[PDB]
Design an enzyme around this catalytic site. Structure first.
Site, PDB file in Angstrom:
ATOM      1  N   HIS A  85       0.838  -1.261  -0.074  1.00 42.59           N
ATOM      2  CA  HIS A  85      -0.018  -0.006  -0.090  1.00 42.59           C
ATOM      3  C   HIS A  85       0.920   1.294   0.003  1.00 42.59           C
ATOM      4  O   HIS A  85       1.876   1.071  -0.069  1.00 42.59           O
ATOM      5  CB  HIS A  85      -1.059  -0.203   1.143  1.00 42.59           C
ATOM      6  CG  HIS A  85      -0.646   0.323   2.506  1.00 42.59           C
ATOM      7  ND1 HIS A  85      -0.235  -1.069   3.261  1.00 42.59           N
ATOM      8  CD2 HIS A  85      -0.474   1.420   3.289  1.00 42.59           C
ATOM      9  CE1 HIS A  85      -0.144  -0.379   4.626  1.00 42.59           C
ATOM     10  NE2 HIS A  85      -0.198   0.944   4.759  1.00 42.59           N
ATOM     11  N   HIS A 150      -7.216  -1.889   5.936  1.00 40.55           N
ATOM     12  CA  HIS A 150      -6.288  -0.834   6.575  1.00 40.55           C
ATOM     13  C   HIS A 150      -6.196   0.507   5.603  1.00 40.55           C
ATOM     14  O   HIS A 150      -6.097   1.619   6.050  1.00 40.55           O
ATOM     15  CB  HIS A 150      -5.074  -1.258   6.628  1.00 40.55           C
ATOM     16  CG  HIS A 150      -4.076  -0.243   7.224  1.00 40.55           C
ATOM     17  ND1 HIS A 150      -3.903   0.150   8.319  1.00 40.55           N
ATOM     18  CD2 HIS A 150      -2.963   0.168   6.349  1.00 40.55           C
ATOM     19  CE1 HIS A 150      -2.584   1.065   8.281  1.00 40.55           C
ATOM     20  NE2 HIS A 150      -2.226   1.061   6.860  1.00 40.55           N
TER      21      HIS A 150
HETATM   22  C1  LIG Z   1      -1.385   8.410   9.050  1.00 39.15           C
HETATM   23  C2  LIG Z   1      -1.487   8.957   7.608  1.00 39.15           C
HETATM   24  C3  LIG Z   1      -1.060  10.213   7.422  1.00 39.15           C
HETATM   25  N1  LIG Z   1      -2.162  11.170   8.078  1.00 39.15           N
HETATM   26  C4  LIG Z   1      -0.577   7.933   6.950  1.00 39.15           C
HETATM   27  C5  LIG Z   1      -0.434   7.069   8.418  1.00 39.15           C
HETATM   28  C6  LIG Z   1       0.900   6.678   8.925  1.00 39.15           C
HETATM   29  N2  LIG Z   1       0.964   5.226   8.817  1.00 39.15           N
HETATM   30  C7  LIG Z   1       2.080   4.320   8.969  1.00 39.15           C
HETATM   31  C8  LIG Z   1       3.322   4.804   8.315  1.00 39.15           C
HETATM   32  C9  LIG Z   1       2.067   4.133  10.523  1.00 39.15           C
HETATM   33  C10 LIG Z   1       2.531   4.813  11.553  1.00 39.15           C
HETATM   34  C11 LIG Z   1       2.554   4.591  12.737  1.00 39.15           C
HETATM   35  C12 LIG Z   1       2.124   3.567  13.394  1.00 39.15           C
HETATM   36  C13 LIG Z   1       1.532   2.793  12.568  1.00 39.15           C
HETATM   37  C14 LIG Z   1       0.612   1.605  12.636  1.00 39.15           C
HETATM   38  C15 LIG Z   1       0.289   0.829  14.080  1.00 39.15           C
HETATM   39  C16 LIG Z   1       0.502  -0.617  14.062  1.00 39.15           C
HETATM   40  N3  LIG Z   1       0.085  -0.638  15.485  1.00 39.15           N
HETATM   41  N4  LIG Z   1      -0.065   0.415  16.216  1.00 39.15           N
HETATM   42  C17 LIG Z   1       0.260   1.458  15.156  1.00 39.15           C
HETATM   43  C18 LIG Z   1       0.117   1.148  11.591  1.00 39.15           C
HETATM   44  C19 LIG Z   1      -0.580   0.199  10.861  1.00 39.15           C
HETATM   45  O1  LIG Z   1      -1.485  -0.478  11.632  1.00 39.15           O
HETATM   46  O2  LIG Z   1      -0.585  -0.359   9.775  1.00 39.15           O
HETATM   47  N5  LIG Z   1       0.702   1.921  10.425  1.00 39.15           N
HETATM   48  C20 LIG Z   1       1.631   3.166  10.950  1.00 39.15           C
HETATM   49  C21 LIG Z   1      -0.475   4.874   8.291  1.00 39.15           C
HETATM   50  O3  LIG Z   1      -0.828   3.474   8.405  1.00 39.15           O
HETATM   51  O4  LIG Z   1      -1.339   5.964   8.633  1.00 39.15           O
HETATM   52 ZN   LIG Z   2       1.206  -0.429   8.570  1.00 33.16          ZN
HETATM   53 ZN   LIG Z   3      -0.408   1.792   6.466  1.00 31.66          ZN
END
Ligand SMILES: C[C@@H](CN)C[C@@H]1CN([C@@H](C)c2cccc3c(-c4cn[nH]c4)c(C(=O)O)[nH]c23)C(=O)O1
Ligand SMILES: [Zn+2]
Ligand SMILES: [Zn+2]
Length: 232
Positions: A85, A150
């Site tokens: 993704h 997700h």
């Molecule tokens: C946030 C959006 C911009 N406004 C784009 C964001 C950033 N980003 C990604 C890069 C991200 C950052 C930090 C933590 C997680 C987790 C997670 C998993 N356990 N606890 C938190 C997950 C997931 O669950 O895959 N991913 C993350 C994401 O997924 O959204």
């Molecule tokens: Zn992730």
């Molecule tokens: Zn993600």
């Protein structure tokens, strides 16, 4: 020393590999985001005398470290990569990969979202994945689009030789209470998308989440449960 490596065990900037099956490894790295540190997984699949990489190691320096760790531990060239993704834990590092001669791929939906949001952009578009339930072959794996979960573009990856299901961030680890980062998620469709994965891959033996510990098929139902409860 043999256990699946965890967030407090990996300094940001180092990468560890974990053997999942013959010719299948996960890669694990850590990164800071909004002032907290998280682990994240990807996949490596042997493709004859080459390697197929699934997902970056969440950042340019981590992804350089990934390439070095692959050379140390496996010693075969990474020739292609697929990002599952558009978020930085999946594409951050694509510029490093491309400059190292790796051909980078993602769905057109992932490429459009990465471009729009200012994330690194895989070079090559993966057609044939735009409808939920679609599947295409890519070297030693099958790529499957389960529907929005997700993120709207999330892909899953199956290794048929080993019955390994790499769920990416559409699948959560068993210890997870929360649904992770839901900023771009579709909580209403996510259970339906998981159901499609469960129906399509009933013989999966190992299920790998986008973050945290692999397990078995129970990760799929657990993911549906935590997402439904988050929405509730
Ligand atoms: C946030 C959006 C911009 N406004 C784009 C964001 C950033 N980003 C990604 C890069 C991200 C950052 C930090 C933590 C997680 C987790 C997670 C998993 N356990 N606890 C938190 C997950 C997931 O669950 O895959 N991913 C993350 C994401 O997924 O959204
Ligand atoms: Zn992730
Ligand atoms: Zn993600």
């Amino acid at each position: 020393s043999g256990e699946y490596p965890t967030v407090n065990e990996i300094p940001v900037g180092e990468v560890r590999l974990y053997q999942i099956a013959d010719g299948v490894w996960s890669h694990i790295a850590t990164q800071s985001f909004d002032g907290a540190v998280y682990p994240s997984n990807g996949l490596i699949v042997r493709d004859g005398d080459e390697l197929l990489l699934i997902d970056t190691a969440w950042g340019a320096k981590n992804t350089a470290a990934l390439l070095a760790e692959i050379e140390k531990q496996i010693g075969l060239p990474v020739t292609r990569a697929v990002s599952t993704h558009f978020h930085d834990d999946r594409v951050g590092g694509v510029d490093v990969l491309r400059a190292a001669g790796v051909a980078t791929y993602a769905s057109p939906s992932t490429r459009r979202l990465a471009e729009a949001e200012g994330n690194e952009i895989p070079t090559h578009s993966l057609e044939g994945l735009s409808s939920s339930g679609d599947a295409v072959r890519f070297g030693p794996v099958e790529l499957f689009y389960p529907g929005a979960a997700h993120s709207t573009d999330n892909l899953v990856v199956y290794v048929p030789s080993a019955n390994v299901l790499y769920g990416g961030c559409a699948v959560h680890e068993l210890s997870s209470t929360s649904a992770g980062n839901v900023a771009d998620a579709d909580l209403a469709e996510w259970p339906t998308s998981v159901e499609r994965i469960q129906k399509h891959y009933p013989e999966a033996e190992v299920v790998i989440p986008g973050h945290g510990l692999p397990g078995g098929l129970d990760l799929l139902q657990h993911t549906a449960n935590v997402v439904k409860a988050h929405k509730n």
